C-alpha cells in the first residue's frame, strides 16, 4: 500500500501520491478508496476486478483522458462515483457498462458537449446527476430519461444555455408523473420561446444569477405562464454582475404561475415594496434569506401566507404583522439589535426568534402575541429578557427555551406559574442565582430541565424540585454547588439521568438517591469527592453508569468499606482502570483490607 490507511482494512485514503495505476496490494473487503490528483492518464480493463466490495470511489483531477471498454468491470456495489476535473471530452458508448448500482454520478467539468451523447441509458438506479460547468448548450432533455425511472435531481448550473424552446421539456409534458428537480443557475438565459412551459410540473427550480437586464428578466419571467412549481428560488450572487434597479413590476408574469413556496435570496438593491406585490397573495410559504430588508411595514390582509421565514436578513425594527392565516413565523440570526413589538397573529403556533439580540422587556402576556394556540417558543441566545408576567394566556406552550439570554427578575415570583402543560424547559447559562424555593412552581408536567451555569444561595442545593414529579431528565452540571441539602430528590420517582459533573462537592452521600427508583445514570465526576458517607447499599441497583473520574478519593484506609465497594461493584463504574488515589501513596487502585 503506497498510501495511508485510515481504518484497518477499510477506508484506504490514497490521495496525491505519484501513481499511474490503482495499487494492486490494496486489500479487498475495503469500502472507500480516494485516488485524487494522482497522475493517471487512462483506465484499463478489469483494473478494479477484485474490489467487489467497494462502494465509494473518487477520481478527481486525475488526468483521465480516455476509458477502456470494460473499465469498471468488477464493480458491483459502487454507489457514488465522482469524476470531477478529468478532460474526458467524448464518452463513447459502452462506458458505465459494468456499473449496476450507481446512485450518484458526478461529471462536473469534463468538457462535455451535450446531454444526448451521454451513454447512461441503462443506469436504472441513478438518483442524482450533476453536469455543471460542462459546455452544454441546450436544456433539451433526452428521450432515454424514460428509462431512468428513479431520477429526482438534475443540475445544469454554469453551462452555456441560451434559450428555452417548446420542444425541450417535451419529455415532461408526455410524462406527467416524473418527480424531477431542475436547476439552471448562472445560465445566460435571454429568450424563453413563448408557450415553453405549459402543463409542466417541477418540484423545484433555481434561477439565481441568470439575468442582468431589468426588461429581459421581466419578459422572460412573464413567459413562464402555465408552470406549476413547488419551490421557486430567485436571487443573485454577490460576486457576479447583477441588476442595479429592482422594482415590483418585474414580478409581473409571476401573477399567473402556481407557486407553492417562494424563496427570495440575496438581492443587490431591494425595496421593501417587492414583498407587498398584489400577486404574491396566493403564495403558501414566503421566505427571505440574506435580503437586506429594513422595514416590513404593512402587508395586505388577504395574503394567504401560511409561513414566513427571515434568516440572516438585516432589520432595524421588529416588523408589524396582522396576517390572520400566518402560522410558524421565524426570524433568526438577524444582523441587528432589535426590541420586540406587540403583534396580532390569531393563528400562530410556532415562534422562533433565536440568535438575535431580541431584548424583550415586557413578557409572557397574551397581549404581546394574540394567539391562544402557541406550542413552541424559543428565545435562545438573545440579549436580555425581563419577566413581568406568568404566561397568563399562553397556557398551551409545550416547548420553552431561554438559553444564553440574561434572564432578569425570574426569582422574584413564581414565573412559569401558568404553564401547567409544558414538557421541555431550558434555562441553562442564564445567570440565575436560585434563591427562592417556588421558582419552579406550576410545572406539573415538565420532563427535561437544563440549568448549567446557574448558581444557588450558599452554594447549597435548596429544595426546589417539589411538585415536579414527572421530571425524567435533570441536568445540574457546571453549577458551583458545595453541598446538597437534605431531602432533595425525595419525590423524583422517575428521574433517569442525573448529571452533576464539574461541581465542587467535598464528599458523597448515599442517603440521597435512596428514592430514585428508576435512576440509571449518575454522572458525578470532576467534582472532587473524597468518599461516600452513609451505608453504601442504599443506592438504587438500577444504576448502570457512575462516573467517578477526575475525583480525589483518598485511599488511606479512609472508609475501608467504601474503598472495597469501589473495586467490588465496578462492573458499573466507568473506567475503573485509571482510578488513582490522592493521599500518599498515589498511583494505586486496591486497598489491602478485604471484606
Amino acid at each position: 500500500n503506497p498510501c495511508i490507511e485510515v481504518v484497518p482494512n477499510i477506508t484506504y485514503q490514497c490521495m496525491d501520491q505519484k501513481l499511474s495505476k490503482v495499487p494492486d496490494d490494496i486489500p479487498s473487503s475495503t469500502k472507500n478508496i480516494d485516488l485524487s490528483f494522482n497522475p493517471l492518464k487512462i483506465l484499463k480493463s478489469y483494473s478494479f476486478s477484485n474490489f467487489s466490495e467497494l462502494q465509494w470511489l473518487d477520481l478527481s483531477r486525475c488526468e483521465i483522458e480516455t476509458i477502456e471498454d470494460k473499465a469498471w468491470h468488477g464493480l458491483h456495489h459502487l454507489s457514488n462515483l465522482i469524476l470531477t476535473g478529468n478532460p474526458i471530452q467524448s464518452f463513447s458508448p459502452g462506458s458505465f457498462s459494468g456499473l449496476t448500482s450507481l446512485e450518484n454520478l458526478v461529471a462536473v467539468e469534463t468538457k462535455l458537449a451535450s446531454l444526448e451523447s451521454f451513454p447512461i441509458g441503462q443506469l436504472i438506479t441513478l438518483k442524482k446527476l450533476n453536469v455543471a460547468h460542462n459546455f452544454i448548450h441546450s436544456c433539451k432533455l433526452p428521450a432515454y430519461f424514460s428509462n431512468l425511472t428513479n431520477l429526482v435531481h438534475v443540475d445544469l448550473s454554469y453551462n452555456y444555455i441560451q434559450t428555452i424552446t417548446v420542444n425541450d421539456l417535451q419529455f415532461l409534458r408526455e410524462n406527467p408523473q416524473v418527480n424531477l428537480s431542475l436547476d439552471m443557475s448562472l445560465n445566460p438565459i435571454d429568450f424563453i420561446q413563448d408557450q415553453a412551459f405549459q402543463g409542466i410540473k417541477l418540484h423545484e427550480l433555481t434561477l439565481r444569477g441568470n439575468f442582468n437586464s431589468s426588461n429581459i428578466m421581466k419578459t422572460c419571467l412573464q413567459n413562464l405562464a402555465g408552470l406549476h412549481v413547488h419551490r421557486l428560488i430567485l436571487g443573485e450572487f454577490k460576486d457576479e454582475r447583477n441588476l442595479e434597479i429592482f422594482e415590483p413590476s418585474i414580478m409581473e408574469g409571476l401573477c399567473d404561475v402556481t407557486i407553492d413556496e417562494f424563496r427570495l435570496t440575496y438581492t443587490n438593491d431591494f425595496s421593501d415594496d417587492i414583498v407587498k406585490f398584489h400577486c404574491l397573495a396566493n403564495v403558501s410559504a414566503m421566505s427571505l434569506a440574506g435580503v437586506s430588508i429594513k422595514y416590513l411595514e404593512d402587508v395586505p390582509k388577504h395574503f394567504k401566507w401560511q409561513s414566513l421565514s427571515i434568516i440572516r436578513c438585516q432589520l432595524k425594527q421588529f416588523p408589524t404583522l396582522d396576517l390572520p392565516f400566518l402560522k410558524s413565523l421565524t426570524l433568526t440570526m438577524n444582523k441587528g439589535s432589535i426590541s420586540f413589538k406587540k403583534v396580532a397573529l390569531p393563528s400562530l403556533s410556532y415562534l422562533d426568534l433565536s440568535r438575535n439580540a431580541l431584548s424583550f422587556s415586557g413578557c409572557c402576556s397574551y397581549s404581546d402575541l394574540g394567539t391562544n394556540s402557541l406550542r413552541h417558543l424559543d428565545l435562545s441566545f438573545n440579549g436580555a429578557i425581563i419577566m413581568s408576567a406568568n404566561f397568563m394566556g399562553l397556557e398551551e406552550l409545550q416547548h420553552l427555551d431561554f438559553q444564553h439570554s440574561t434572564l432578569k427578575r425570574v426569582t422574584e415570583f413564581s414565573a412559569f406559574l401558568s404553564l401547567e402543560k409544558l414538557l421541555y424547559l431550558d434555562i441553562s447559562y442564564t445567570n440565575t442565582k436560585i434563591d427562592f424555593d417556588g421558582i419552579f412552581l406550576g410545572l406539573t408536567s415538565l420532563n427535561t430541565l437544563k440549568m448549567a451555569g446557574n448558581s444557588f444561595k450558599d452554594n447549597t442545593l435548596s429544595n426546589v424540585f417539589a411538585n415536579t414529579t414527572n421530571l425524567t431528565f435533570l441536568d445540574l452540571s457546571k453549577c458551583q454547588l458545595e453541598q446538597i441539602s437534605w431531602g432533595v430528590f425525595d419525590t423524583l420517582h422517575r428521574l433517569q439521568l442525573l448529571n452533576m459533573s464539574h461541581n465542587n462537592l467535598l464528599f458523597l452521600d448515599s442517603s440521597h438517591y435512596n428514592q430514585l427508583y428508576s435512576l440509571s445514570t449518575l454522572d458525578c465526576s470532576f467534582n472532587r469527592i473524597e468518599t461516600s458517607k452513609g451505608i453504601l447499599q442504599h443506592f438504587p441497583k438500577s444504576l448502570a453508569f457512575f462516573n467517578l473520574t477526575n475525583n480525589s478519593v483518598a485511599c488511606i484506609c479512609e472508609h475501608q468499606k467504601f474503598l472495597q465497594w469501589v473495586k467490588e461493584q465496578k462492573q458499573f463504574l466507568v473506567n475503573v482502570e485509571q482510578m488513582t488515589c490522592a493521599t500518599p501513596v498515589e498511583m494505586n487502585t486496591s486497598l489491602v483490607l478485604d471484606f
Partner: protein, 136 residues
C-alpha cells in the same frame, strides 16, 4: 385587628407591628380584588419624620416561603409626584392616592407582608405594619 376588608376573592387585614406602635389610619376603595383592581387608598396620620426621603422595606411570605426583600421608593426629594412628600414631622397628613393593577396570576393560599416605612435621610422607622392576605 386594626382594619380588614372582604373582597370578592380576597380577605385583607392589617395590625400594628411589635417593636413599633405609631398610629396611622389607612384604607382602600374598593376592597382590592387580587384578580386586578382600580381604585383609591386613603391615608391619615401625623408623621414622626420628614417624609421627604420615604421608602418601604417589604418582607413578603407566600405559604411560608420567604421571598427576597423588596425596597420601594416613594419620594426621592426632587420634584416628587405626590403632595405629601412635602409634609414635616408633626404636620397632619390626610390624602387619597389612586392606583390600578392587572395581568398577574397569584398562587392561592395565605400571604404575609411586613411593610416598614423608613425615612431615608436619617434611617428611622416611621411605622411598621403587619399585613395578612388570604386568597381564595
Amino acid at each position: 385587628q386594626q382594619w380588614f376588608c372582604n373582597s370578592s376573592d380576597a380577605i385583607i387585614s392589617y395590625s400594628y407591628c411589635d417593636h413599633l406602635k405609631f398610629p396611622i389610619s389607612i384604607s382602600s376603595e374598593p376592597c382590592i380584588r387580587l384578580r386586578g383592581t382600580n381604585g383609591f387608598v386613603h391615608v391619615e396620620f401625623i408623621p414622626r419624620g420628614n417624609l421627604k426621603y420615604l421608602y418601604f422595606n417589604l418582607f413578603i411570605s407566600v405559604n411560608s416561603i420567604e421571598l427576597p426583600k423588596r425596597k420601594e421608593v416613594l419620594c426621592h426629594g426632587h420634584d416628587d409626584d405626590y403632595s405629601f412628600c412635602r409634609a414635616l414631622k408633626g404636620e397632619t397628613v390626610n390624602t387619597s392616592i389612586p392606583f390600578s393593577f392587572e395581568g398577574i396570576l397569584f398562587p392561592k393560599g395565605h400571604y404575609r407582608c411586613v411593610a416598614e416605612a423608613i425615612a431615608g435621610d436619617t434611617e428611622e422607622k416611621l411605622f411598621c405594619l403587619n399585613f395578612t392576605i388570604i386568597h381564595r
